[PDB]
Structure formats: C-alpha cells, structure tokens
TrEMBL record:
Organism this protein belongs to: Cereibacter sphaeroides (strain ATCC 17023 / DSM 158 / JCM 6121 / CCUG 31486 / LMG 2827 / NBRC 12203 / NCIMB 8253 / ATH 2.4.1.)
Pfam families: DUF1153
MF terms in GO: sequence-specific DNA binding
Gene3D superfamilies: Winged helix-like DNA-binding domain superfamily/Winged helix DNA-binding domain
Protein name: DUF1153 domain-containing protein
Classification lineage: Bacteria, Pseudomonadati, Pseudomonadota, Alphaproteobacteria, Rhodobacterales
Amino acid sequence: MYLKRVDGPRQVTLPDGTVLSRADLPPLDTRRWVASRKAAVVKAVIHGLITEREALDRYSLSEEEFALWRSAVAAHGEKALKVTMIQKYRQLHHH
C-alpha cells in the first residue's frame, strides 16, 4: 500500500476491559462528538487499531482537534502521574 495503510489488529483491548473493534468506531456522519465517542477514536489510534491520519481523514478532523481528544481522554488524568500514567505520556505525543 502507499500512504493508506491502516495496519494493526481488527480489534484491540482497552485498559477498561472493553473491546474496541474496527466496527466499534463511531459513525462518520456523527458530529455531536461526546466524550465516549472521542475516547473510542483516540483509544483506537493509541492501541494501534487505526492510525491518527485515518481518524482525521474519516471523521474530518484536524490534528489540533485530535490533540484535544487525547488530552481530554487519555492524558486528562494528570491529577497524579500513576506509574502506568508515564506509559501514557510515552506513547501519547505532545500533551
């Protein structure tokens, strides 16, 4: 493939204990982006379900937008840097 290669598993696992498949991704027509829908998208990229540029592509988003998403979901727990929270900031780039 060239440019468009969305590699990774068909379904990834969440730290929540939930399963995030490539079918679990929120609708493309949706614009009322609630927290959980934003979470689903960002977790997908983080877990390697899809790629960041694929999310921005299909949902019609900007990178600064996705920056908000990952900051509001994955790295919003900056109350205390849990031992596992460092891993967040290791894979999450630019919070």
